[PDB]
């Protein structure tokens, strides 16, 4: 799976969309993403950068 969307096949783009559909519907109903939306997103990039 290449980083940019122009390189993989049209079929390979579709499961990128269908996995994206799952990731919102598990997160928009998540308990943390109801009080401080900007804080949770910023904390998510805080740990993601720290790991990488």
């Amino acid at each position: 799976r290449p980083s940019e969307l122009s390189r993989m096949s049209a079929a390979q783009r579709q499961q990128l969309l269908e996995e994206e559909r799952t990731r919102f519907q598990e997160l928009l109903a998540s308990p943390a993403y109801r009080a401080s939306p900007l804080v949770a997103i910023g904390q998510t990039l805080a740990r993601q950068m720290q790991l990488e």
């Binding site: 980083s3 940019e4 969307l5 990128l16 994206e20 990731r23 919102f24 997160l27 928009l28 993403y33 939306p37 900007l38 997103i41 998510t44 990039l45 993601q48």
Partner: peptide, 14 residues
């Protein structure tokens, strides 16, 4: 905008 913010956390494409 709060409905699109979780696109900021995921894969490098999104």
């Amino acid at each position: 905008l709060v409905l699109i913010y979780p696109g900021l956390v995921g894969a490098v494409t999104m």
